[PDB]
Amino acid sequence: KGKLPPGPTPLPFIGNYLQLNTEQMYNSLMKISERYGPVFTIHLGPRRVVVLCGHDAVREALVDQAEEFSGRGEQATFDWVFKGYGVVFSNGERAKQLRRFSIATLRDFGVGKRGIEERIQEEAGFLIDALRGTGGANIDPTFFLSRTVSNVISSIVFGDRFDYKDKEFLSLLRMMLGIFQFTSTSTGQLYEMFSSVMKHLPGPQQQAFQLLQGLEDFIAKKVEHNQRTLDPNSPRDFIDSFLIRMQEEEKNPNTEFYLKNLVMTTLNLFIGGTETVSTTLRYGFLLLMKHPEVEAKVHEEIDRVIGKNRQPKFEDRAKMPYMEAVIHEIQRFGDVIPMSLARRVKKDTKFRDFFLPKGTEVYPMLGSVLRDPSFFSNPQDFNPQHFLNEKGQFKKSDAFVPFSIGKRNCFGEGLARMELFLFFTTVMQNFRLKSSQSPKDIDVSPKHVGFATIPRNYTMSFLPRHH
Numbered sequence: 001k002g003k004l005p006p007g008p009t010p011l012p013f014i015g016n017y018l019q020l021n022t023e024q025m026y027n028s029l030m031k032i033s034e035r036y037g038p039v040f041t042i043h044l045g046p047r048r049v050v051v052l053c054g055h056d057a058v059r060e061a062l063v064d065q066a067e068e069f070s071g072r073g074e075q076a077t078f079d080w081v082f083k084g085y086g087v088v089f090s091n092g093e094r095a096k097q098l099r100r101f102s103i104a105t106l107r108d109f110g111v112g113k114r115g116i117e118e119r120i121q122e123e124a125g126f127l128i129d130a131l132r133g134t135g136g137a138n139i140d141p142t143f144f145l146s147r148t149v150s151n152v153i154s155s156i157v158f159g160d161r162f163d164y165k166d167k168e169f170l171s172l173l174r175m176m177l178g179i180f181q182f183t184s185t186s187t188g189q190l191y192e193m194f195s196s197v198m199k200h201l202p203g204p205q206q207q208a209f210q211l212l213q214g215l216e217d218f219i220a221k222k223v224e225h226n227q228r229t230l231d232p233n234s235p236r237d238f239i240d241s242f243l244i245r246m247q248e249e250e251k252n253p254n255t256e257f258y259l260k261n262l263v264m265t266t267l268n269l270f271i272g273g274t275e276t277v278s279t280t281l282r283y284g285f286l287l288l289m290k291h292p293e294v295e296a297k298v299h300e301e302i303d304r305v306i307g308k309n310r311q312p313k314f315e316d317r318a319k320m321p322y323m324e325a326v327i328h329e330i331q332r333f334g335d336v337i338p339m340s341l342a343r344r345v346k347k348d349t350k351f352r353d354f355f356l357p358k359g360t361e362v363y364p365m366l367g368s369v370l371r372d373p374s375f376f377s378n379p380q381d382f383n384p385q386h387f388l389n390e391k392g393q394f395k396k397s398d399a400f401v402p403f404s405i406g407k408r409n410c411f412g413e414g415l416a417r418m419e420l421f422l423f424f425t426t427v428m429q430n431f432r433l434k435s436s437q438s439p440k441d442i443d444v445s446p447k448h449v450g451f452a453t454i455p456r457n458y459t460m461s462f463l464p465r466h467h
């Protein structure tokens with residue numbers, strides 16, 4: 001039947017709000033799924049959204065009907081600053097043009113090649129110095145990890161890294177951490193439903209907007225400088241490249257290459273290339289302290305394959321199935337972006353005997369794919385075996401979708417995977433982790449779950465490995 005997926009009856013404007021717990025959107029949605037099935041319709045305030053739970057529904061839509069589900073839906077807190085500009089939250093021609101250019105420009109600046117691998121290895125060296133600098137003292141690893149991660153994408157988009165002592169750099173990192181935290185709280189999820197009123201009201205969301213505003217202001221300041229020092233012949237970074245394409249297109253009235261898309265696209269990458277990787281690393285170390293046996297096996301593999309002298313290199317991954325399994329399990333357990341970024345159908349679509357009118361938003365519940373009990377034996381526990389066969393070799397999974405899938409999937413996945421492996425490996429090779437508390441008492445449940453999955457605050461010490 002040409003019918004929209006089934007779902008609970010919505011009330012005018014508020015939608016299904018009375019049937020949802022904004023502090024736990026994910027659980028609220030999965031519960032509703034228990035009654036209506038894997039594919040259902042929900043009304044987040046006035047926003048009608050088709051929810052996709054489980055591997056099959058998600059893959060069937062985003063991959064089997066990729067083009068139809070390739071539209072970009074909204075994320076209200078982020079659209080407040082982006083407003084449809086830039087590569088992430090853009091649609092149609094704007095997105096195709098910005099995405100093609102971004103992927104190309106990233107590769108031209110080392111992504112995938114030896115260039116960025118070297119940059120990551122150097123930055124990891126700096127992270128190691130910094131952790132040695134704590135003298136084994138108990139610390140909050142949060143900004144040690146974010147400063148390192150950020151410098152990778154920062155050297156690509158800005159021309160070079162930030163000094164670890166640059167206070168403005170810490171400030172930008174605080175803004176990123178804060179925005180991801182806000183969109184993961186109940187107020188952030190309430191904003192997803194009622195932004196029409198809430199953006200004009202006092203409250204936590206206003207402080208969230210200022211963080212985005214500070215990030216935009218910073219990007220706009222970096223662009224100006226690049227502009228007044230640009231060598232049309234020798235671009236220094238992503239910004240230069242984009243400024244050059246802008247000049248080339250100065251004659252195309254319909255060009256997507258203009259200042260606003262440069263500021264928004266660069267901001268997209270600065271944030272995207274920072275907080276996601278940083279949050280995964282942070283959750284990862286907490287999971288390893290909770291499971292010493294896994295850290296032990298990681299240490300075994302690192303000592304055999306890499307040893308204690310040379311810097312780990314990306315190709316080492318081919319020889320380390322356990323480590324590769326652990327990183328996969330960390331991303332699977334962490335479920336950093338539990339509901340992906342909303343997609344939307346480009347045109348009237350037919351999906352599993354259901355009807356989805358053009359423009360309909362879609363929520364691919366990645367978290368439900370990473371925990372599909374039909375793909376992982378103990379979906380609720382942290383267990384690397386989930387990514388190993390009986391002979392202890394690495395085993396892929398069609399349900400491993402932390403980067404989502406399809407036409408608007410994460411094109412930073414390559415950089416991210418290189419970062420996760422090189423940082424997790426280089427740190428583990430140099431230190432054993434010591435929990436400020438007892439393994440049995442470490443809580444790995446998340447502190448917040450909304451747009452992102454935020455792990456609980458913790459402290460730890462990095463103890464060197466020598467004797």
Ligand code: HEM
Pocket residue numbers: 072087088089099153268269272273274276277280336337340341342343402403404405406407408409410411412413415416
């Ligand atoms: C552990 C790290 C990361 C995770 C879990 C992650 C996750 C995701 C997800 C789930 C999406 C939405 C995909 C979709 O619509 O289907 C996405 C989008 C995107 N990611 Fe990542 N990401 C990570 C790191 C990166 C990095 C390092 C960069 C930057 C180079 C980045 C750049 C982007 C961009 C530009 C998009 C938007 C793509 C588009 O709309 O066409 N991501 N990411």
Ligand SMILES: COc1c2occc2cc2ccc(=O)oc12
Pocket residue numbers: 078088267268269271272273276337341
């Ligand atoms: C481009 O990278 C990303 C992301 O990647 C994965 C999640 C995610 C969220 C944002 C939000 C704002 C932004 O500017 O960028 C983002």
